[PDB]
UniProtKB/Swiss-Prot annotation, chain C:
The chain holds residues 1315 to 1364 of 1970 of the full protein. It comes from Cricetulus griseus (Chinese hamster). This is DNA-directed RNA polymerase II subunit RPB1. Belongs to the RNA polymerase beta' chain family. The tandem heptapeptide repeats in the C-terminal domain (CTD) can be highly phosphorylated. The phosphorylation activates Pol II. Phosphorylation occurs mainly at residues 'Ser-2' and 'Ser-5' of the heptapeptide repeat and is mediated, at least, by CDK7 and CDK9. POLR2A associated with DNA is specifically phosphorylated at 'Ser-5' of the CTD by CDK7, promoting transcription initiation by triggering dissociation from DNA. Phosphorylated at 'Ser-2', Ser-5' and 'Ser-7' of the CTD by CDK9 (P-TEFb complex), promoting transcription elongation. Among tandem heptapeptide repeats of the C-terminal domain (CTD) some do not match the Y-S-P-T-S-P-S consensus, the seventh serine residue 'Ser-7' being replaced by a lysine. 'Lys-7' in these non-consensus heptapeptide repeats can be alternatively acetylated, methylated and dimethylated. EP300 is one of the enzyme able to acetylate 'Lys-7'. Acetylation at 'Lys-7' of non-consensus heptapeptide repeats is associated with 'Ser-2' phosphorylation and active transcription. Regulates initiation or early elongation steps of transcription specially for inducible genes. It is found in: Nucleus; Cytoplasm; Chromosome. Component of the RNA polymerase II (Pol II) core complex consisting of 12 subunits: a ten-subunit catalytic core composed of POLR2A/RPB1, POLR2B/RPB2, POLR2C/RPB3, POLR2I/RPB9, POLR2J/RPB11, POLR2E/RPABC1, POLR2F/RPABC2, POLR2H/RPABC3, POLR2K/RPABC4 and POLR2L/RPABC5 and a mobile stalk composed of two subunits POLR2D/RPB4 and POLR2G/RPB7, protruding from the core and functioning primarily in transcription initiation. Part of Pol II(G) complex, in which Pol II core associates with an additional subunit POLR2M; unlike conventional Pol II, Pol II(G) functions as a transcriptional repressor. Catalytic core component of RNA polymerase II (Pol II), a DNA-dependent RNA polymerase which synthesizes mRNA precursors and many functional non-coding RNAs using the four ribonucleoside triphosphates as substrates. Pol II-mediated transcription cycle proceeds through transcription initiation, transcription elongation and transcription termination stages. It comes from the Eukaryota. Signal peptide: none annotated.
Length: 66, 260, 50, 62, 115, 82, 152, 67, 44, 148, 151
RNA sequence: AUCGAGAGGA
């Protein structure tokens, strides 16, 4: 916690590891914003983690459906 | 490309076992005969129990399981009875089943041994082996004064593939090449091993000289009967059952060949 | 050979020189390095903080 | 004492807990099996993001 | 809970064929006989009888799973012969062998009981 | 970003293959037209793999770069290894 | 320890520019493993020019285009004539050996201990063996491979 | 609790031999000679008779539920 | 010559196959690769 | 004919290193007509070989008396005239190595052909003149017969 | 519970895709207890199989072309060897050199390097087990084994 | 049903 929760990883990633209450309380006191870049934050919010099959987007090819 | 011409030599025939030798047959035929002795020779055994009253110290399934394992004389009746699968009757009928009744009550002060002698049948031909007219009767349960066991069983036709209670054998000794001439076994120290009862070797010689051109022939059998069938009836019924398995297989084979 | 002195002979072969090495029970890497006849190039420590 | 029939268990959309609407705990409660932190880490290493989302969002408490 | 009835090893399910013949395409003049509700008892004898036929090039059997209750017998014969014909002749030969063995065992029993 | 110069790999990643196959299989299962011919296939996954082998999956992979830009690759433009 | 390691590295990932980065988008490695290769495909191999002496290195890696009869044993007639006559080819082979000698010194500074065991993508000796068996190479007959073709 | 009916291994009937076995033991037979007298030659059936604990005799020390 | 050309193609293809895939969670993978052997090595 | 090599060998030693396998024995033999050493692995269980025995060895590329290639497949229902009829012990293997005393500049005066008969190994080494029929990854037969 | 997750698992997490681990660039699963003791006993030099035994074993090869191989011993009696059947098991045309655990260390120096008295020094060529006793070193989870080279 | 405690399995 003294090395991993002292970097700019975002409050939600840090609360997943250790010091859940202290981390979230510090983020509240300082108005920190989690950009939802890591896998922990997306996993908590039930969103597709930017990991493996989630590191890209798929688009439909209108010109090829013909 | 054709069948074997096996010969037979029976070396002992009692009411308890039959010891014989089959020569000039394949090992697969000998082992299929051995397997059919255990698993495809039908007999009669209790396979349905209705406990009307059981104050004994053994629960109902204990008594039922115990009754199922009592051997019933099946010699001439097993060929006549049908499988309840094949019977066109309801749950039961005298063509596919045999009714037993047991009704014992310990009123006296000494322990009452409910034995197989208390299994009363409707069919005189199918009775418990020990009850047949020495060896004592199989013990179903011991009862204390005031305890009572009243039940109604039905015995069916089946073989050992379905349940070991329909297995007629009390051991099938099977052997071949008593002197290790084919070297199908490899003794690290051949001198350490006892000689087979069928061995023909002088005591200095531990195993026969290796036979490169040899094949398993001369299979020795000791078919011990649990009591339901005579040992020779077990062997004859085994051969007949294996032959009918092959005949049914050939019938279905012919239908498949002609349907193509 | 992991602690021997591996040199390259004039013929181009790897040769493992069997030399004296010291193992201390404490660490003053700062001081030990700056000592006469002490190798300031291979002398190391297992205390990563130092 | 450890017979398989006292251990075998399966679940497909059974009861859920009151506080967090997630599957119950235990065979006796017809509960679901825990997809824990180590399973999350394993599937992150696999790179299976949709399976991870299915296990941690859609099969637990949408 | 999951125990199959013991008769399922011997009894055919409705609409299930006792034997099915499928042409093996890897090599010519080969067939696969999938026999349901049989086991090593018939497979071993049928295989070993087929091995006695010089027109049989391959004869083998397998129980693909012990918990399942079928066998597969692969038979390859010479081009002038057929695996179906080989299988038929093997069964015929086994039946004749068992009939002879039964008659000779009856004779041996009669001799033993008499003298 | 200049489509004339795409810096990402010309190969389809294992994750791209996985997600493209799953997506196209779901699309087929939801009655989307199939781009390849079919002998007797009724499983959407088999049809999607056949379309990928034929290089006839109408999907574009938008690969994001760390700087924020992106590169659009047609499934037919990538090299399918497995 | 396992949980701590996981929570410390969980979001580090290989990006589409092939850099390894964490959630903050900071760069941890410009290429994964310093070589941008996955750990499943690599395997143990030996650097053949690391341990040998200068004499052995010369004898095993310097293409000898002066011994006419040795070339006659290794190469076919047209290849032998082209190798012995042409000087452009001889200079190409000479620079090949110089480049291998420079590589030798680079390896000597990379592996200051004489350990030729390395982990690299393609098992070149196994691929060479595969090619020998796929094309039925006869090790006893002269080859039709031009050494200039090998260099190029 | 009670003598099994069959030998677990071969299926030989041992249920009718427990009482005879006990009667032979009180007749000053050794357990081996007693097992030989009953015809238990395979060590599986000898295991069945020799390792049996007649617990039913202890369960019959309790009065039944009904008189 | 045929064997050498095939060898060159094989080396190229296998090398391109050994390249790391974007989207590999190498950090979680490395944490697992370093923690799994830790469960076997001795405490004392 | 299809014969790569033929000679008469004399068993000079059996298992110098000791018996390694029970049913298999290694014979170190030498011929007289060509002065070729032979290491041979034989199944002594079915074809016992005693020290000092003398046998004719014939490495062949085919069993058919007429020049005709083999398919490497087992065909027991084959009625063609096979040269295995004239021999007692027959094995079927493949050449997996050919060594020699060649230098960078000189050809080989002595060769050493290695054959594996399904794991039973043979090394036939001697003058290179007698081992031109051997090529690596090529199937051969043993065709060995004992003589008095 | 979806085609997308099913495709994900089928293309990423299936066991055959999991044979080689990135942790140590070697197989993670290998041949194990009975199969390993038995393959060691099977590939010994004095393992000779009869025609019926060989057909029995070939029934259990899924990747069999249906061609019985020419036995290693034709006379006095046709006998196949265990290496001759494992050669049928071995896939493709892989090439591999290993050494059985009992390989003496002073054998690769003296003569008999390529004809091993102890049947050590595993050599697979073109997908045929030319020689050697297979063991943990050849079929286990170490690097450069037959299972690794097959993968 | 919840909470706790205890006993176990790998
Ligand atoms: Zn009826
Ligand atoms: Zn018994």
């Amino acid at each position: 916690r003294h090395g991993v929760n002292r970097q700019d990883t975002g409050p939600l990633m840090k609360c997943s590891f250790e010091e859940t209450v202290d981390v979230l309380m510090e983020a509240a006191a300082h108005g920190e914003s989690d950009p939802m870049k890591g896998v922990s934050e997306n996993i908590m919010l039930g969103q597709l983690a930017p990991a493996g099959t989630g590191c890209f987007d798929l688009l439909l090819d209108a010109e090829k459906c013909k | 490309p054709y069948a074997n011409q096996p010969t037979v030599r029976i070396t002992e025939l009692t009411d308890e076992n039959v010891k014989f030798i089959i020569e000039n047959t394949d090992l697969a035929v000998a082992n299929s005969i051995r397997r059919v002795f255990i698993a495809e020779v039908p007999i009669i055994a209790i396979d349905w129990v209705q406990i009307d009253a059981n104050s004994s110290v053994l629960h109902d399934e204990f008594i039922a399981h115990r009754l199922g394992l009592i051997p019933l004389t099946s010699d001439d009746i097993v060929d006549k009875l049908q499988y309840s699968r094949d019977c066109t009757c309801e749950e039961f009928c005298p063509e596919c089943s045999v009714e037993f009744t047991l009704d014992v009550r310990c009123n006296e002060d000494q322990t009452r041994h409910v034995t197989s002698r208390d299994l009363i049948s409707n069919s005189p031909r199918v009775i418990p082996v020990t009850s047949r007219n020495e060896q004592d009767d199989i013990l179903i349960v011991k009862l204390r004064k005031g305890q009572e066991l009243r039940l109604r069983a039905y015995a069916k036709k089946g073989f050992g593939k379905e349940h070991a209670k329909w297995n007629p054998t009390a051991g099938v000794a099977f052997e071949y090449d008593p002197d290790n001439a084919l070297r199908h076994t490899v003794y690290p120290k051949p001198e350490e091993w006892p000689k087979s009862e069928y061995s023909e070797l002088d005591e200095d010689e531990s195993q026969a000289p290796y036979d490169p051109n040899g094949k398993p022939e001369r299979f020795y059998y000791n078919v011990e009967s649990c009591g339901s069938l005579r040992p020779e009836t077990i062997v004859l019924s085994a051969l007949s059952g294996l032959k009918k398995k092959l005949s049914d297989l050939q019938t279905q084979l012919s239908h498949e060949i002609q349907s193509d | 050979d992991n602690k021997k002195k591996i040199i390259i002979t004039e013929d181009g072969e790897f040769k493992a020189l069997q030399e004296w090495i010291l193992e201390t029970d404490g660490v003053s890497l700062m001081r030990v390095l700056s000592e006469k006849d002490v190798d300031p190039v291979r002398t190391t420590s297992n205390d990563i903080v130092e | 004492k450890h017979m398989v029939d006292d251990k075998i268990h399966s679940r497909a959309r059974g009861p859920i807990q009151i506080l967090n609407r997630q599957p119950m705990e235990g065979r006796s409660r017809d509960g679901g099996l825990r997809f824990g932190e180590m399973e999350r880490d394993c599937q992150i290493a696999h790179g299976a993001a949709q399976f991870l989302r299915e296990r941690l969002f859609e099969a637990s408490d949408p | 809970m999951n125990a199959p009835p013991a008769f399922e090893s011997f009894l055919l399910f409705e609409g299930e064929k006792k034997i099915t013949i499928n042409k093996d395409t890897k090599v010519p003049n080969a067939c696969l006989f999938t026999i349901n509700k049989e086991d090593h008892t018939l497979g071993n004898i049928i295989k070993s009888q087929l091995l006695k036929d010089p027109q049989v090039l391959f004869a083998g059997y397998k129980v693909p799973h012990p918990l399942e209750h079928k066998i597969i017998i692969r038979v390859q014969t010479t081009p002038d012969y057929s695996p179906q014909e080989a299988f038929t002749n093997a069964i015929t030969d086994l039946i004749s062998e068992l009939s002879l063995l039964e008659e000779r065992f009856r004779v041996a029993i009669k001799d033993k009981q008499e003298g | 970003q200049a489509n004339q110069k795409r810096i990402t790999t010309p190969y389809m990643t294992k994750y791209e293959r996985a997600r493209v196959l799953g997506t196209r299989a779901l699309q087929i299962a939801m009655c989307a037209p199939v781009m390849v011919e079919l002998e007797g296939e009724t499983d959407p996954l088999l049809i999607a793999m056949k379309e990928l082998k034929a290089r006839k999956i109408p999907i574009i992979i938008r690969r994001y770069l760390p700087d924020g830009s992106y590169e659009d690759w047609g499934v037919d433009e990538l090299i399918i290894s497995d | 320890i396992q949980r701590r390691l996981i929570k410390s590295m969980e979001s580090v990932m290989v990006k589409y520019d092939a850099t390894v980065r964490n959630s903050i988008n900071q760069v941890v490695q410009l290429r994964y493993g310093e070589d941008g290769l996955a750990g499943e495909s690599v395997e143990f191999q030996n650097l053949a020019t690391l341990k040998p002496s200068n004499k052995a290195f010369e004898k095993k890696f310097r293409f000898d285009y002066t011994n006419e009869r040795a070339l006659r044993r290794t190469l076919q007639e047209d290849l032998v004539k082209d190798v012995l006559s042409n000087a452009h080819i001889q200079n190409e082979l000479e620079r090949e050996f110089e480049r291998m000698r420079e590589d030798r010194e680079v390896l000597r500074v990379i592996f200051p201990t004489g350990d030729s065991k390395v982990v690299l993508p393609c098992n070149l000796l196994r691929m060479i063996w595969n090619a020998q068996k796929i094309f039925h190479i006869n090790p006893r007959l002269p080859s039709d491979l031009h050494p200039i073709k090998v260099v190029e | 609790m009670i003598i099994p009916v069959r030998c677990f291994t071969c299926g030989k009937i041992v249920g009718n031999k427990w009482e005879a076995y006990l009667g032979l033991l009180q007749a000053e037979y050794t357990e081996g000679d007693a097992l030989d007298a009953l015809g238990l030659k395979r060590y599986c059936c000898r295991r069945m008779l020799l390792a049996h604990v007649d617990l039913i005799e202890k369960l019959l020390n309790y009065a039944p539920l009904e008189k | 010559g045929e064997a050498f050309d095939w060898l060159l193609g094989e080396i190229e293809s296998k090398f391109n196959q050994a390249i790391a895939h974007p989207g590999e969670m190498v950090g979680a993978l490395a944490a697992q690769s370093l923690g799994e052997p830790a469960t076997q090595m001795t405490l004392n | 004919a299809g014969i790569l090599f033929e000679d008469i060998f004399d068993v000079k030693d059996i298992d110098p290193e000791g018996k390694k396998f029970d049913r298999v024995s290694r014979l170190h033999c030498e011929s007289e007509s060509f002065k070729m050493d032979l290491i041979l692995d034989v199944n002594i269980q079915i074809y016992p070989v005693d020290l000092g025995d003398k046998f004719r060895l014939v490495i062949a590329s085919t069993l058919y008396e007429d020049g005709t290639l083999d398919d490497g497949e087992y065909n027991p229902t084959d009625d063609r005239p096979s040269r295995a009829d004239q021999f007692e012990y027959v094995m079927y293997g493949k050449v997996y190595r050919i060594e020699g005393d060649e230098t960078s500049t000189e050809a080989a005066t002595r060769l050493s052909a290695y054959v594996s008969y399904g794991g039973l190994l043979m090394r036939l080494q001697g003058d290179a003149n007698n081992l031109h029929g051997f090529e690596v990854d090529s199937r051969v037969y043993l065709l060995m017969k004992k003589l008095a | 519970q979806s085609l997308e997750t099913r495709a994900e698992i089928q293309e990423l997490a299936m066991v055959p895709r999991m044979i080689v681990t990135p942790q140590s660039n070697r197989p993670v699963m290998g041949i194990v207890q009975d199969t390993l003791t038995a393959v060691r006993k099977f590939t010994k030099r004095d393992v000779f199989l009869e025609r019926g035994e060989v057909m029995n074993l070939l029934m259990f090869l899924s990747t069999w072309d249906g061609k019985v191989p020419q036995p290693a011993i034709l006379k006095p009696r046709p006998l196949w060897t265990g290496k001759q059947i494992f050669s049928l098991i071995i896939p493709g045309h892989i090439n591999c050199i290993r050494t059985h655990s009992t390989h003496p260390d002073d054998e690769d120096s003296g003569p008999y390097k390529h004809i091993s008295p102890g049947d050590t020094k595993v050599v697979v060529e073109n997908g045929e087990l030319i020689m050697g006793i297979l063991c943990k070193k050849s079929l286990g989870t170490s690097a450069g084994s037959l299972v690794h080279i097959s993968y």
